[PDB]
């Protein structure tokens, strides 16, 4: 059973990560992420949404999933990995 690794770009353009789905989830639920935050799922395994290794806003990740439970990261791994 696979857990994803994620990166994100801050407002100074620095790349942080890779951080696990669980970590990303916690920060999401913590309210730390803006919907404008550019994030990326690392292409460590195949996945059915089609977001491996691309940078998209958190808001766009959610438009693609069309439904989330507690957070888009956990949802992604559950539904697409």
């Amino acid at each position: 059973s696979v857990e994803s690794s994620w990166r994100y770009i801050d407002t100074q353009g620095q790349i942080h990560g890779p951080f696990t789905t669980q970590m990303m989830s916690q920060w999401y639920i913590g309210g730390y992420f803006a919907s404008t935050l550019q994030i990326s799922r690392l292409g460590s395994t195949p996945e059915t949404l089609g977001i491996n290794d691309i940078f998209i806003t958190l808001g766009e990740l959610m438009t693609k999933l069309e439904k989330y439970d507690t957070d888009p990261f956990t949802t992604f791994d559950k539904l697409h990995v």
């Binding site: 994100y8 801050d10 100074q12 620095q14 942080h16 920060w27 992420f33 935050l37």
Partner: peptide, 7 residues
């Protein structure tokens, strides 16, 4: 506790 680079 906050993610690095975001505040």
């Amino acid at each position: 506790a906050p993610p690095p680079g975001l505040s």
